[PDB]
Design brief:
The structure is cut from a larger assembly and holds seven protein chains of seven kinds. Chain A is α+β, with helices and mostly antiparallel strands. In chain A, 12% of the residues lie in helices and 18% in strands. In chain A, the strands form two sheets. A two-stranded antiparallel sheet of chain A has the order 1-2. A two-stranded antiparallel ribbon of chain A has the order 3-4. The radius of gyration of chain A is 19 Å and the shape is elongated. Chain G is mainly alpha-helical. The chains are: A alpha+beta, B alpha/beta, C alpha+beta, D mainly beta, E mainly alpha, F little secondary structure, G mainly alpha. The interface between D and E is medium-sized, with 20 and 19 residues. Chain E binds one RNA strand through helix 2, helix 5 and helix 6. Chain E: InterPro entries: Ribosomal_uS15 (IPR000589), Ribosomal_uS15_arc_euk (IPR023029), Ribosomal_uS15_N (IPR012606), uS15_NS1_RNA-bd_sf (IPR009068).
Amino acid sequence: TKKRRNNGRAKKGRGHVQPIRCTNCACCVPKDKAIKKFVIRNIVEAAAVRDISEVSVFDAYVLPKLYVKLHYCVSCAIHSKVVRNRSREARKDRTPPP
Amino acid sequence: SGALDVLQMKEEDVLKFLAAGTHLGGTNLDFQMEQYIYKRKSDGIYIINLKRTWEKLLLAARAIVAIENPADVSVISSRNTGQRAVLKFAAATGATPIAGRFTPGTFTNQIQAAFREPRLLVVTDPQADHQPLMEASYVNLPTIALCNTDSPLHYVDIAIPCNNKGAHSVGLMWWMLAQEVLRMRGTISREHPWEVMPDLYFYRDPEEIEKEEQAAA
Amino acid sequence: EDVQGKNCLTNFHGMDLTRDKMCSMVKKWQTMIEAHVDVKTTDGYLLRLFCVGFTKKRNNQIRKTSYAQHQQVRQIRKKMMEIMTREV
Amino acid sequence: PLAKDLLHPSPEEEKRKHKKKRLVQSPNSYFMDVKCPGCYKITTVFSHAQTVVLCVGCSTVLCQPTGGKARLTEGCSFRRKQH
Amino acid sequence: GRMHAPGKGLSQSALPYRRSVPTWLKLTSDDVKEQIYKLAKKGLTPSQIGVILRDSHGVAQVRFVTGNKILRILKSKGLAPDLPEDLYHLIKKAVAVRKHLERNRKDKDAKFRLILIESRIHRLARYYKTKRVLPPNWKYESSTASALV
Amino acid sequence: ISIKLQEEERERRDNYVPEVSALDQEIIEVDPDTKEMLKLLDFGSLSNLQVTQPTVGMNFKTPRG
Amino acid sequence: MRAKWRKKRMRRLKRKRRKMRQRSK
RNA sequence: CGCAAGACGGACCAGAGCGAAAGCAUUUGCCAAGAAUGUUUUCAUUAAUCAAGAACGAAAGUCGGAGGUUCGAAGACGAUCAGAUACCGUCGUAGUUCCGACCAUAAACGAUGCCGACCGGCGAUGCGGCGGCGUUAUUCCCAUGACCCGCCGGGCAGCUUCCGGGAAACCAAAGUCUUUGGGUUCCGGGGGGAGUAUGGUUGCAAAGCUGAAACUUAAAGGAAUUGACGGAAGGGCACCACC
């Protein structure tokens, strides 16, 4: 039986979308279908923002962040626990989780 | 209410509406409430037609008076605001109040303790008080409703267009309806500004109850 | 270019943006506008100036998207190329 | 609403609706007494012109064509004439 | 719904109820016909005539002002074209496309749009042969088409 | 729970009423658009209705996303 | 037996019938 | 730090757009094309759907050139394994790319023919048009952009409702069907045998289109419910669990 209205993916009036490669695996996945997750992330977490800022030649030097748009294979994503299975009620929730 | 002078809208009544805020709708509009409206504002808020409000108020009160035994009218509020207002309305009119939590099966399950079998419902909000509106549809119950401009008119037989959101507006609207059912019954006369004060029906936030507990001395 | 004696005499070879900044600027729900200009200075130095632009979500803009039309993009791109030529 | 006066649409409702879907079919165009201040003669221009209506005995060019209603050149006034 | 598109457009021109002429229009039916002749002599179609008239000369419908319509005013005197303007314009478009497609065999979309236009022609040709405003001997051939400007 | 009185702060105190009601405003704030509707009733002109300069720049909706 | 492989088997079986039929020609 | 070649067009990129479908994403120019809106323009039934016939038709595959960066059917190894002609790894020919010619098939899917009418509500978005306080730019007014608040048409959608339907899942269409008739094309008739044999036909080939029978069989199947089960996800308990 038809599980999703939007057949997993997000194309409505296309017919074809360019595929991307899942990052964990490397499997050809349609762009709209893929679980895209954008990650801004400090080059050092907490243990080193203490130590590196102390040895900062500078005075009041902000650190850079690392900007990587991850794509994911549906298997890629669920094994990596990015997306969980939800109840047939809670499948219809599209709001990104708090 | 209609083509008549004795039941026509008076001047202190308009001041009581305009002061309460019963002319302020929501930002939204129910398709079924487009007749009980004048115009929008800037800030998007819809203005209710207080004449049409009064026409529905008297129609409602007419329906309430037509019930012979008063003790089978159910006066329902669940939301905080109307809880006090309906509890006073039933004191004034000899009706039966349901203030706060409405037990599903009151109108339906004949073995429950709260098995009241009324002849007419009055409802502070169709949205908040949706369960009794649905249970009115299992034991033939006409419903009166205090409907905001975005209140769903499912199972509502007379929609009184108001600002059922604001605490002043609700207390006022119940007082107006309580004073009109008594005037039509013939318990008050229409020449005397009624002894009972519309402040008696107002919900009081527990910041304003603890404002009274201090400021007596 | 030249080495005199304990002095490496250097000359401008090309400005670049930090990946940190360049990535930070590329946000979803707005139009990116790139241009590039093959140009020559008054002295015979030849440059390729790459511009980037991003449409601004307005002060009172309630609509989520902040996208140009394509004619709006290409008129902006035409002014980018016009200005980079004009000021090199 | 169940009951609508389908024969008597209030003019707020009729002018709202699509021209074809009005109870009786009625256009959203009109003829303009367009006069330029340089010349003497009042030319009759169609609102949705879609040509360059010129001043006969050239003092100017009056309107310029767009998607819908033409742009009347800055300086020109217009009365909408009716029957 | 369109013939050779999925388009369900409703961009129609909507004539007013009152077929009765307006008041302001001072041009008599004869001077309108005289101006129609002047436009036809310049080298305009009944479509182009009607536009130029309603824009610059405030004449909504020639049929409303006069009795008759613009082709029938052209046709009575013999200013009307030999083959209709609309079937002219499709043959004109088909010669334009076919010229583009002489040196663009890769352009498969063009080739498909050509077949759609060819079908519009054959379809109108067949209509006008029922009304004998074209000869029964006539048939649009794409090799004979470039002479028909 | 359910006791005899109900319960001297719900029966007795709930008959609390101030000196004059909050609906007894000497100057009622009012927009020109509800003035426009009262003008199309019998109540064209009251004395205790101070009509404000109308609110400018329609900007009330919550931005999306 | 996946339906694609049943087809592939039956397709290669048909290819070995245009071998035993190709001898009498 | 350069050089060369060939692929590919990240992020922007959306339940966004365009296209008959397949499909389509650097810049700029040329070329014809196109829907939608606008229209008091014109022709005046020219139309809807369609045996025959026809155009386009992913990927793989075939033939003759050009090129060969990456990736990689076959193959050579290296592991895992009981075996492992597989999953994993290193190489790697055809191929992947371009040109000309085939081939005509995909879960070519919305598994939903096309045209038309009618029957709910809601806020969004894309295109055009029309109207309306205000802010901003070309500042020097305009008028145009950018927001803002509405309306109209056309489109991709979404949410919601005891419209109604349906075996249900679900569908504003899959509704307006025993209250059964708006037009029309294709096409199904229990499961297998079988998309097989055979004949024709198209193709260089691989194959495609049309396509049975004997025989075999009491079921195969659809949706949903409950349970058990999982080498799925989360929560909880226990010194017959751990610390």
